[PDB]
Design a protein around this ligand. Structure first.
Ligand SMILES: [Mg+2]
Ligand SMILES: [Zn+2]
Length: 466
DNA sequence: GACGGTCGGGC
DNA sequence: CCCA
DNA sequence: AGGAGGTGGCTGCCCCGACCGTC
RNA sequence: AGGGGUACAUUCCGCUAGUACUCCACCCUACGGGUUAAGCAAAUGAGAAUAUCGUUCGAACGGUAUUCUUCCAUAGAGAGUUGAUAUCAACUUUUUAUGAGCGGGCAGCCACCUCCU
């Protein structure tokens, strides 16, 4: 790929590209981040057509079709999306739930040990993935581990439900299958399913849908349960998680979203992520700049300050009583979680804005691993933290999910020569950190980020990947 | 004697 | 080669 | 070195028939 | 004045805003002050409980693990407690009303990576 330039008129894209100096009209964000806009002086009329949403992800389509292969029930393909229903178990119910978490972890560990003990290696240390997968069958492992499973169940007076422990065995088998799939695909050279300890910090117990009856789950032992919403309409297997850091019992119920009809505007977009502007949106009838890093610093100034000071305290002041060390670790996790929550909320709100404004998003594929790698020092370690906490890849995940949830096709594009390539004439110029992109051939005076976003849009409407 | 709840396995 |  | 956290990647998001408890 | 933390009917997970409480420098004089001082180890606290052990005298002190509490606001009424003259001021509690808008798909595992020191 010697050039990623396709003349705009080939793509029916107006050559409009704003000057780097503009007057930006702010967009209300209801969030910490700042969103700006610059309406094109000359705009084509906005189209519109009827769409049925949510759109089911292709991977979810495959998953549900395969789940229908075992003829569980001939149910229509649906768009699943979790939901956080908080529980308020009592002291007794809290103790029972903790014991059930312990038994779930113990069965998970036993299943992992069973698989490893029966894991078969192909001649050499290489794992014969097919045979190990067959060993990872939930039915076979459940039958084989009946004695150990029964002993585990018959060891606590509020004995866990057999069907929950079977869910634990299935989860262990699925995780081993995940690692095996990674192995065969060479995504990991070796793996080791670490046992679940008492300090896992995030304990999960999977509850079958059938157990959700009479406004509770497992009524035989939990006759009554407090929850944010009624538990009378759950129809899919649920996972109950306890977060020691947050001390919150939460049900991640995968709920069904009924498909309805909406009006979507034909507005192809392009996004060039990075630093100094988290997302520079360019659209044929509009240009937007999202979350400049100055406000990012201002919001994260406190969190980074506290994180650094806690780390320095831990290191430079050793031989601290574990109580103090544990408190410092708790605070560190709290401030990291605050940063993560800020970033997640910005991601979700920005995705909402973009999908509701555009029906097709061509976002750049910023390989954060390559950028963060210590191999290149072109970005200092101080900024590498900001790029890391910005969590661009998680943003891409959430944006893709939102686009599915609102019928917006979030295409992924690799930004290669986007910054260098001229959007108008196609001259390839290296500039470095310069904000202003001024082509010497065609004379375009365009902001660099906006030009990169336009290039991303152009390649997205006709990528060369095939 | 007839409705729910969990258990046993199904692939 | 994207980040500056 | 000892703690964060990320980045990608993959797998899930069950069910019908017996058998038993209660009326 | 500026900054941090905690809580907030408003289903829950959060973000923003706001509100309320609390905390952030030196000299002490060192339980009351000034500095004009913006304080940046400000919950990274504080307190209670469970233990398992070592020491001092069953208690305390220490670790090593856990856990649990750290307050919704304003306005109007009811009740209770305290001070002052059945009435006024302060505190606890029941109750009526009002109390911003924006999103929300996650769980688990793995390998690798960055960061702070
Ligand atoms: Mg770019
Ligand atoms: Zn040019």
């Amino acid at each position: 790929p010697k050039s990623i330039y396709v003349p705009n008129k080939d793509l029916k894209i107006s050559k409009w590209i704003p000057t780097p100096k503009k007057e930006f009209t702010e967009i209300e964000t209801n969030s910490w981040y700042e969103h700006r806009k610059f309406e094109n002086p000359n705009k084509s009329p906005v189209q519109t057509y009827n769409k049925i949403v949510p759109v089911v992800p292709p991977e979810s389509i495959k998953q549900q079709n395969l789940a229908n292969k075992r003829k569980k029930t001939n149910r229509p393909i649906v768009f699943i999306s979790s939901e956080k229903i908080r529980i308020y178990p009592t002291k007794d119910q809290q103790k029972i739930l903790q014991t059930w978490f312990r038994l779930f972890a113990y069965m998970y560990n036993c299943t992992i040990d069973y698989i490893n003990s029966k894991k078969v290696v192909l001649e050499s240390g290489r794992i014969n993935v097919a045979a190990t997968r067959k060993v990872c069958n939930k039915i076979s492992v459940r039958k084989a581990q009946k004695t150990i499973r029964d002993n585990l169940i018959q060891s606590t007076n509020p004995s866990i439900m057999t069907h929950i422990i079977d869910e634990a065995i299935g989860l262990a088998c699925s995780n081993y299958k995940t690692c095996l799939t990674n192995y065969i695909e060479r995504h990991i050279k070796k793996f080791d399913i670490k046992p679940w300890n008492m300090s896992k910090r995030k304990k999960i117990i999977i509850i079958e849908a059938n157990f959700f009856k009479k406004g509770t789950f497992c009524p035989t032992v939990f006759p009554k349960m407090e929850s944010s919403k009624p538990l009378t309409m759950i129809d899919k297997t649920v996972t109950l998680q306890y977060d020691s850091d947050t001390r919150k019992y939460i049900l991640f119920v995968p709920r069904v979203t009924p498909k309805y009809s909406v009006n979507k505007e034909k507005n192809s977009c392009g996004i060039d992520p990075g630093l100094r502007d988290f997302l520079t949106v360019y659209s044929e009838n509009e240009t937007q700049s999202i979350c400049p890093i100055e406000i990012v610093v201002n919001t994260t100034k406190n969190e980074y300050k506290k994180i650094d000071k806690i780390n320095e305290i831990i290191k430079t002041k050793p031989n601290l009583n574990s109580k103090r060390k544990k408190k410092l670790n708790r605070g560190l996790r709290k401030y990291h979680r605050r940063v993560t929550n800020k970033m997640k909320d910005m991601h979700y709100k920005v995705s909402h804005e973009l999908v509701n404004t555009f029906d097709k998003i061509c976002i750049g594929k910023l390989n954060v691993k390559s950028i963060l790698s210590k191999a290149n020092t072109v970005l200092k370690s101080a900024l590498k933290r900001k790029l890391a906490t910005l969590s661009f890849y998680r943003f891409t995940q959430r944006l893709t999910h939102m686009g599915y949830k609102y019928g917006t096709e979030v295409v992924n594009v690799n930004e290669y020569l986007t910054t260098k390539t001229c959007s108008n004439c196609g001259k390839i110029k290296d500039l470095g950190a310069s904000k202003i992109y001024e082509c010497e051939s065609c004379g375009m005076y365009a902001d660099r980020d906006e030009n990169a976003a336009k290039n991303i849009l152009k390649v997205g409407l006709k990528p060369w990947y095939k």
